[PDB]
Each structure stands twice: as C-alpha cells, then as structure tokens.
Design a binder for this molecule. Structure first.
Ligand SMILES: CC(C)(COP(=O)(O)OP(=O)(O)OC[C@H]1O[C@@H](n2cnc3c(N)ncnc32)[C@H](O)[C@@H]1OP(=O)(O)O)[C@@H](O)C(=O)NCCC(=O)NCCSC(=O)c1ccccc1
Ligand SMILES: CC(C)(COP(=O)(O)OP(=O)(O)OC[C@H]1O[C@@H](n2cnc3c(N)ncnc32)[C@H](O)[C@@H]1OP(=O)(O)O)[C@@H](O)C(=O)NCCC(=O)NCCSC(=O)c1ccccc1
Ligand SMILES: Cc1cc2c3c(c1C)C(C)(C)C[C@@H](O)N3c1c(nc(O)[nH]c1=O)N2C[C@H](O)[C@H](O)[C@H](O)COP(=O)(O)O
Ligand SMILES: Cc1cc2c3c(c1C)C(C)(C)C[C@@H](O)N3c1c(nc(O)[nH]c1=O)N2C[C@H](O)[C@H](O)[C@H](O)COP(=O)(O)O
Ligand SMILES: [Ca+2]
Ligand SMILES: [Ca+2]
Ligand SMILES: [Fe+3]
Ligand SMILES: [Fe+3]
Ligand SMILES: [Fe+3]
Ligand SMILES: [Fe+3]
Ligand SMILES: [K+]
Ligand SMILES: [K+]
Lengths: 514, 514
C-alpha cells in the first residue's frame, strides 16, 4: 500500500521534473500566511510547504491549479479549446472505477478509530484577518453507490470542526449533496460519506464541477469522468467502519455520517445570536466576504491516512484565487459546451468562463452561424445556459472573430454589437439563484439573507453576435502585421524594448492584426 | 523662423533624451508598412522613420501617443487620475494664444502658392490591403476667429486629394466643423480654414477631443486648452493667402477654403456607382472597416511648410491603434469628469475610457457615495453622459473599490453588481447616434447607411455601483498580501519565476489583495 499510480505525489514528481515546482522548508502558519502567499502569487506555479505550523506530520501544497497552462500540460492538452473538447468527450465516455483491497490502498496505512480530533491531524486555515474560525476547506465529498443511484459524486464541502469529531458541512442548495440530502431527509439512518484529502488532480478537477445537471445529473459517474480525464480508472477501497467507498490514492480520509436534521451554526458569533447570513465566514466564490449559516453536521467515525512518517500532503486553497476558479470553471466550461452541442451541433465553437466573471455567475460562448437557418440559435443557447445553471447571472454570446480569452475584446463586443432593446435577455425572473451573490441580498430585504428569502432577478443573456448576412458591415479591420518584418527596420534591442511595454489588449490585437 | 519652443521637434529631442525614441534609417513604404509596423507594436514607444518611400523631403513619426505613460511623462503628470484632473483644470482655465509675425513662424519658411499637388508633399498612407485610395489622415483643422465665434477649434479631418489641389473633407455630423458648416451652409463665400501637420503634441492632444460640447461648446478656445496643457501659449501666425490663422510651430500647413455645398465622393468606386456607406474606406474608430461617403471639398490655395532640407515631420497613424485611442479619449475623459463635477461635486472619483470600449462609444465613471442623500446621483451622471455625448453606446458606473483600468474588474462588477431589471438605463431611444457603428446600420434597413437614415437604440447606462448602506454585504475580500513577505520563504529565483507567469487580473488582484 505505497503506490498510487496517478495521484498527488506523482503529480508533484512531474512538476519537479518540469521545473514548475516551488518548494520551501520554512515553517508557515496556516493562520494568514498560506492564503496570503497564494494571493501574492495568484495564478502561478505550485507552492509546496514542507513544514506547517503545529502540523509536524503534514505538508501543504497550494496554487496547484493556479496556472491553467501547467494543468493542461499535466493532463496532456495543447490549449484550452482542446481541453474543453476533450473533457466534453470524457464526460460522454466515463471509465468505471476499480475497487482494490483494503491492504493495497495507501490511504489506509494508518487507521485511527479513537481519539478523533480532526483539527489535530487536518490543517485548518484562516484566509483573512476578519475571520474568527479556522476552517477545513481542503476535502472533497465522496458518495458512491446506493445513495447516488449507483453512480458517484465528488465535490468540495467546507467544514468547521468545533465539536471535536463533529463539524458543520456546508451544502449548496441544488447540488448533488443537496439532492442526496433532500431524498434522505426524512430518514432515521444518517447518510454515510467520506471526505477525501490530497486526492489525485483529476478528482480535484471533476470535484470542481457544479450546477451542470443537464449534462451531469444525479446518478452520473463523476469519478468515472475523473478516470476518463486521467486516462486510467480511479481506484476505490471499502471503508473500515462505514458502508461506503473512498478514493484509495488519497492522503487523508475522514469516514463518518451526515446528519441532515442536526443543523448547527458555523461560527461562534452567529451561534451566539442566532442569525444566518450576517457574520463573516471566509471569502466566497462571488468575490465577497462570505457569511455564516446553519449547516448539517458530519459525525466523523474514523480518520484514515497515509503514514505520518511519509508526511501526507493536504491542499488548502483560498477561495478568491485563480486556483479555485480554474478548479470549478474548467469542467463547467466543458459541460456548457456539451449542452450547446446537444441542442444543435456545430454552432458553438468555444466556451470560456474567465476568472473575472465568477465560479457560478457567468460564461462566454462563441458561436458561428453557417447559414440563415442558424440565425437565432445563440438566443436558445443563452436561455438554455441560464436556465440549466441555477443562478448564472450573465451569459454572453459572441461571434467567431473575437478573442474569447480577452475581456477587453468582450467589452468591445458589448460596446459595438449589442442592441440594448433587443439583445438583452432576462429569461427567468423569479427563478432559483445563488444566495452567495449580495445582489440577491438586495432582494431579500429585511428578512434573513438565506436561500429561502432571496428573489432572483432573472439573469442577463447578452447576444453580442453579428447578425447573419451582415458580416461585411461588421468586418474586423485586419492590418498588415505579417506583410512587414520589424527585423528589417530595427535591431533586436529596439524590438524587445518596444515589446516589453505592450500588455493586454494590444498583445491580443498585435497577434491577430485587428 | 527656426525655433518652435514647444513643438514636435523638441518632443522628439526629449524622447531621445529619455531613451523612448526608436529611430530607423531604412526606406519605409506608406503603402501597408507604416500602419502595419504601428499595429505590430501597438501601444508602445514612438517610431521615427527618416526615409519615406517617394517622399525624399519628409520624415514620419508614429506611435507618438501610443504609450500613455510616456505621454504623461511628457506633459508632467504622475498617473492617469492626475492627468484627468489637471486637464479638467486646464479646460476651465485656458491660456490665450499669442500671434507672432510672418517671419518668425517656422511653418512659413517655404510658401508654395503654385504647383499645388498635395499628394506630392504630404504623405498619404494606406492602412489595409482592402483599400484602393491612399488618403491623408495626418492633419488637424484650425478655425480661429469669426467663424468660431471668437474662439478656436482644432480637430482631425481625413482628406483624399484626388483632384490635385481639391480633396474631400470628412466632417462628423454634430462636431464643431459641422456646426460651423451648418451655420455657413447657405453662404456664397466659402469657409477659410487651414490644415496643420506635425503640430505640437498639446495641439494633437486637444484635437482628439470631440462630442463634449456641454464642456467645450462652440466658441470655446481649444488652442487655449492646448496652451494650458503645455503650460505656455501656442503661437499663431496670419496666413499668406486666406484670412485665417495657423499654428506657427507646425511642420506643414495647407491653406484654402471649404466649400460645403460642393460635395464629392471619397473613393472612385463609390463615385462609380453613387452609393454612400458601402465601399471600403480605411478602418474606423468603432473597430470596423470604414465606408466611403460624400464629403465637402477643401480647395487648397497655398502649401506652406518648413525647409525641405530640414525634413519636416508628418504624423501618420492608423485608426484602430492605441495611439488614436489615447488621442481622443484622454481629453474626452477629462471633459466627462468636468461635467460630472459640475452637476454634483465630490462624487465622481475617476473617469476612464479604455481602448477596448471605443473612441466615442463608451466610458467608465467611478463614484463614491458619502451619505444616503447622494444615492442615485450615478444615474443622473449616466443619463447626462449618454445625453451629452451624441451616440455613446455604453456608460458604466462602478464603485470605489474597483480597479477602473482593468476590464476584468469591470466584468466582475457587471456579473455581481447589476440588477438586470433596474440597473440598465436606456435613456434616449431615437436620439442622435454615430453612423460609424454598424449596430446603427442594422437600424437603417435597406435604406442608405448614412446619418440621415440610422435610428439610435438609445445607449446603455449600467449602474454597477454598490447601494449605500450595503457596503458590508458588498465588501471586497482583502487578503493578507502585506502581512507575509515572500522573501523569507523563497529565494529570488523562485520569486521572479512565479512572478513571470502572472498576467492581467491576477496582477491587479495580487497589488490590492482582493
Ligand atoms: C439554504 C439553507 C440551508 C436553508 O436553511 P434555513 O433558511 O435556515 O431554514 P431551515 O434550515 O430551518 O429549513 C427550512 C425547512 O424546510 C425543510 N427543509 C430544509 N431543507 C430541506 C431539504 N434539503 N429537504 C427537505 N426538506 C428540507 C425542513 O423541514 C426545514 O424545516 P425543519 O428544519 O425541519 O424545522 C440556509 O441555511 C442557507 O442559506 N445556506 C447557505 C446557502 C448556500 O448558498 N451555500 C453555498 C455553499 S457553496 C460555496 O461555498 C462555494 C462555491 C464555489 C466555490 C467556493 C465556495
Ligand atoms: C451625414 C452626411 C454628410 C449626410 O449626407 P446625405 O445623407 O448623402 O444627404 P445630403 O448630402 O444630400 O444632404 C441632405 C440635405 O440636407 C441639407 N444639409 C445637409 N447638410 C447640411 C448642413 N450641415 N447644414 C444645413 N443643411 C444641410 C442640405 O440641404 C442637403 O440637401 P442638398 O445637399 O442641398 O441637396 C453623409 O454623407 C454621411 O453619412 N457622412 C458620414 C457621417 C459620419 O459619421 N462621419 C464620421 C467621421 S469621424 C471618424 O472618421 C473618426 C472619428 C474618430 C477617430 C477616427 C475616425
Ligand atoms: C473548489 C472549491 C469549491 C467549493 C468550496 C471550496 C473550494 C476550494 C471551499 C474552500 C471548501 C469553500 C466552500 N466550498 C463549497 C462548495 N460547494 C458546496 O456545496 N459547499 C461548500 O462548502 N464548492 C463547490 C463544489 O466543488 C461544487 O462541486 C459543488 O459542491 C457542487 O458540486 P456537485 O454537486 O455538482 O457535484
Ligand atoms: C485622432 C483622429 C481623429 C479623427 C480622425 C482621424 C484621427 C487620427 C483620421 C485618421 C484622420 C481619420 C478620420 N478622422 C476624423 C475625425 N473627425 C472628423 O469630424 N472627421 C474625420 O475624418 N476624428 C476625430 C476628431 O479628432 C474629433 O476631434 C472630431 O473632429 C470632433 O472634434 P471637435 O469638433 O469637437 O473639435
Ligand atoms: Ca476558467
Ligand atoms: Ca483613454
Ligand atoms: Fe457531484
Ligand atoms: Fe447582437
Ligand atoms: Fe473643436
Ligand atoms: Fe447596482
Ligand atoms: K463536482
Ligand atoms: K477637438
């Protein structure tokens, strides 16, 4: 039980071989140093901390998915478009996970069944100095089998263990865990599930997915999609205590039960005066400071991990980082692409969810109309995307002469290609939204800022595409950037001196010439 | 007549002293090489071409205003906010221009009164290979005195001299030249004006202004604003033939008359079949390929210039460059700031028109609400900006915790802070727009794409501001980027290796920590 063929340690070895690994040996605080160093180097190389404060048996990795280029190099993709198409193909073709014995799983070298103090072994962090609680935000849930209709689910859930071996368990309403909890709410037996830590990067990648249930409904095989992404099946193992399955190649696994009707407060102040949605609880995906709520409790029965002499790795990450944004929006991009290809194939060329929009709030699709009969399909695509995403606030459709990765080019399409009377779609006013957007706090009024009181404004679908047959009038003004060579006119020093000053939309426009 | 104290040559000497000047000696074509080399190095250092093809007496400068940092260093401003405030102050305090004699003006060393072939002396360029005509797009008009109500006007006008000494003269409807032409349309005497070339950079800066006539109405002193910007009065000189005044420190001056009722076609193909708004005429400010129209004719009576042995400099520039964008939108930014400060002072903090939006299509203002009584002033500001700009299509108001120079941060505010039911303003449907936007071609139908047939959709004012009293719920999630020092944990090599991979919104977020 010491090999994990494709896991976090092999990924660290590949990162060290490629030269992408930044590793230090100095003792780092989980309090306001890991997330601070992650935000200082946001969207960059992975950082490995060998020594963690008050965690003598644990290492810590961060910014693992921060640069999307090294992630695409890890999984063998050339660019983001190839990544989107390959992960859509992997969604439609899962690899069924294999079950190995309880003696070759590396996560079951040490099995703690007593003295269950989760905060002693797992590294809880604080993100900002405005917080009061150190929370565990590193684990993915793992529901395999009868509670997920014979499929499998992996996904992140934040936990605050402020009762020793009992901690809160934050569930987004509408998610797979919400659907499992809603089905088994009125039950006597609690839901058995495991929280896995230091998982293979494919499992992190698929655990980022969410609110894409027209493509990945309840009963799908998310671990199958992770196995299809890494190109080999993800190994499972039966738990020691509960009746479930874990990722065998993880670094830590918490086994236990979820009690849905046992709801407790996440912080001490919101418990002190009984108010959800007011007190600060570590910044959220929307790009604002989060709020503390009531949440069901996760009753840990066993802590299994690797050997503490091997120093198992945990992956703590801040929420408003490019790390967290890549983790969610990559597989959500390919799911949106899959839905638009299902509705009408051959029209959508590329789907991109930038860091700027949010995890769950926005997307940009790029359509190409081949004839007059395909005119109008972008409005079907925008309405279907906004309806099938639960609280996406802004979907933008652009034409094929646009750089989809530049927000300056998107703003140019918003300025020049949008009729404000006809091209703004508000499809579903009064539907379901995401309560973590404070624009829905503005609709709750003086009631409690919970999901029961918010009112969705309906989303915003912006059709910034060129009408068919008007491609000559909306033609983009390509210059002669390949008809002239600057090496004739200037030397190397003038050329790189002028090239060092360019940044952004000029860098996008100088490649394309438009 | 050989000194111009603040002019283009002194600016070139200062650029060479600062090391910002890139100069070559190889013979460059005005056909598809100058604009190509400008787009290859878009938004960068100035380029000086000593040898121009078929122009043995002329030098050519380009990308002079391409980097806004070297422009702010030239005029003595620290950042863009200081530039906006100082140019607003200079707008409210002009320096009256001085008139010097006809023998100390350096632009009147050589006075050609016969053999007036404008294309022989002035460099006409072609931008894209899709064009057929080589046009002159380097000169600014100069109307001083009785035709501009005792004030002065400077502004660019494109000209195509396809009749020897008679060329077209493109006037935007609504502009100062349009107001002068509209007042003197039914007159027998033509309007006398001069086209000045190679002007001081302050005159280029103020000549970029347009459609800001609540702040700079007809009868204002635009040359006074140029003198206030450079800090010394701009010298004028009486013309040799016509009854007007020119910029004395220019490099070339065309003297002549504008005939408003003598309208001719700009290209040969649109003249060949009598259609405005269809055939390609060198890309425009909207970011599309332009169209050819009918335009009044400029009848050149005299060409005055510097000594041809001194090789006078002309400034040809492509239209969809950061050069052209800085030239217009800088003074238009300060004019929008001045209007918002006039309506209610102390609320607008910063105004920015990025390259991405357009010259005349968009702006971003940044407001700060000090109390509850100032809530709602951003909607007055958006409506006033959209009404007083003639065809601005998209105005966005953001709060003060936003980086106004990052379009990713603006897109984040569009995703998270806009109610699509209440925060989208469409103030003036059916007003006046700009015909060069093809979104107004979509409203002309099968009539002619002219300004007489377009129908404005009304503009789009987006209130992406935080409501007052909800700053705690919309609080931005500042991390500890100054509580931890990366020099402790890593060496220099790991630090700059990680810093070299960051670009864009991560660069904006890693300074601020949010
Ligand atoms: C939505 C709840 C849970 C509603 O609680 P409250 O309003 O306080 O109301 P109650 O709790 O009292 O229950 C009401 C009554 O209805 C019943 N009933 C309830 N549920 C069920 C059910 N499932 N099934 C069946 N029935 C159910 C039940 O009978 C109950 O009555 P009892 O209990 O029997 O007396 C609220 O706590 C909340 O706002 N949570 C936060 C929402 C959120 O957005 N989390 C996002 C995290 S993602 C983010 O971290 C992230 C994302 C990406 C990257 C990074 C980060
Ligand atoms: C707007 C016009 C000029 C209208 O012409 P048409 O539709 O063909 O119609 P007509 O010409 O036949 O005249 C109609 C009748 O009305 C009368 N009348 C007319 N005018 C006046 C008057 N002023 N005053 C009084 N009356 C006037 C007159 O009586 C006339 O009848 P007649 O003539 O007596 O029989 C059109 O040619 C056009 O679309 N131009 C392009 C517009 C444009 O946007 N240019 C933008 C350039 S900026 C860009 O380059 C840039 C910006 C930043 C950076 C970089 C680059
Ligand atoms: C990448 C990432 C995602 C999430 C979270 C974090 C990270 C790093 C935390 C720091 C732990 C903070 C919280 N958190 C979190 C969460 N979803 C929840 O229901 N509950 C949570 O407390 N999402 C999004 C999940 O990853 C989604 O997968 C979502 O759970 C839906 O997934 P699914 O049901 O469709 O399968
Ligand atoms: C910077 C720049 C601006 C302009 C132009 C060019 C450049 C480089 C050309 C390449 C020559 C192409 C055209 N062109 C142009 C033009 N305005 C016109 O009425 N007519 C024109 O043919 N503008 C905008 C003018 O600079 C504005 O100043 C406008 O003229 C309003 O100015 P004003 O009336 O308010 O004073
Ligand atoms: Ca993404
Ligand atoms: Ca600008
Ligand atoms: Fe799931
Ligand atoms: Fe459109
Ligand atoms: Fe003017
Ligand atoms: Fe708002
Ligand atoms: K998931
Ligand atoms: K002007």
């Amino acid at each position: 039980e010491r090999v994990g063929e494709k896991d976090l340690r092999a990924a660290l070895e590949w990162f060290r071989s490629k030269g992408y690994l930044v590793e230090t040996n100095k003792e780092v605080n989980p309090d306001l140093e890991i997330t601070g160093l992650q935000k200082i180097f946001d969207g960059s190389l992975p950082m490995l901390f060998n020594n963690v404060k008050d965690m003598p048996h644990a290492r810590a990795i961060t910014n693992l998915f921060g640069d999307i280029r090294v992630v695409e190099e890890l999984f063998g993709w050339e660019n983001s478009l190839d990544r989107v198409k390959k992960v859509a193909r992997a969604i439609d073709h899962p690899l069924k996970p294999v079950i190995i014995g309880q003696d070759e799983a590396p996560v079951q070298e040490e099995v703690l069944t007593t003295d269950l103090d989760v905060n002693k072994w797992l590294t809880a962090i604080r993100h900002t100095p405005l917080e009061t609680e150190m929370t565990i935000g590193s684990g993915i849930s793992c529901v395999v089998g009868p509670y997920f209709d014979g499929g499998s689910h992996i996904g992140y859930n934040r936990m605050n263990f402020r009762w020793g071996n009992v901690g809160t368990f934050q569930i987004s309403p509408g998610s797979h865990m919400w659907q499992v909890m809603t089905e088994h709410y009125k039950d006597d037996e609690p839901i058995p599930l495991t929280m896995c830590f230091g998982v293979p990067p494919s499992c992190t990648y698929v655990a980022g997915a969410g609110f894409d249930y027209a493509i990945l409904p309840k009963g799908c095989d998310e671990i199958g999609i992770a196995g299809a992404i890494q190109g080999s099946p993800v190994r499972l193992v039966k738990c020691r205590t509960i009746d479930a399955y874990t990722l065998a190649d993880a670094e830590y696994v918490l086994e236990g039960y979820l009690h849905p009707r046992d709801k407790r407060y996440e912080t001490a102040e919101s418990e002190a005066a009984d108010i959800q949605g007011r007190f600060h609880f570590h910044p959220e995906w929307a790009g604002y400071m989060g709020k503390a709520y009531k949440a069901p409790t996760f009753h840990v029965t066993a802590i299994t991990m690797r050997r503490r002499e091997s120093k198992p790795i945990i992956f703590p990450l801040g929420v408003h980082t490019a790390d967290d944004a890549n983790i969610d929006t990559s597989v959500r991009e390919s799911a949106i692409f899959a839905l638009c290809e299902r509705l009408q194939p051959g029209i959508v060329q590329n789907v991109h969810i930038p860091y700027c929009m949010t995890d769950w709030g926005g997307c940009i699709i790029q359509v190409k109309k081949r004839n007059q009969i395909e005119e109008g399909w972008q409005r079907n695509f925008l309405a279907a995307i906004l309806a099938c995403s639960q609280g996406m606030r802004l979907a933008i459709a652009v034409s094929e002469d646009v750089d989809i990765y530049s927000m300056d080019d998107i703003m140019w399409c918003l300025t020049t290609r949008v009729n404000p009377q006809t091209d703004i779609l508000n499809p579903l006013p009064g539907g379901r939204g995401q309560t973590f957007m404070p624009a829905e706090r503005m609709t709750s009024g003086d009631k409690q800022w919970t999901a029961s009181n918010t009112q969705f404004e309906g989303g915003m679908g912006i059709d910034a595409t060129v009408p068919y047959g008007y491609e000559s009038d909306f033609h983009r003004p390509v210059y002669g950037v390949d008809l002239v060579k600057p090496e004739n006119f200037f030397d190397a020093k003038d050329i790189d001196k002028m090239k060092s000053r360019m940044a952004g939309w000029v860098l996008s426009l100088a490649r394309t010439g438009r």
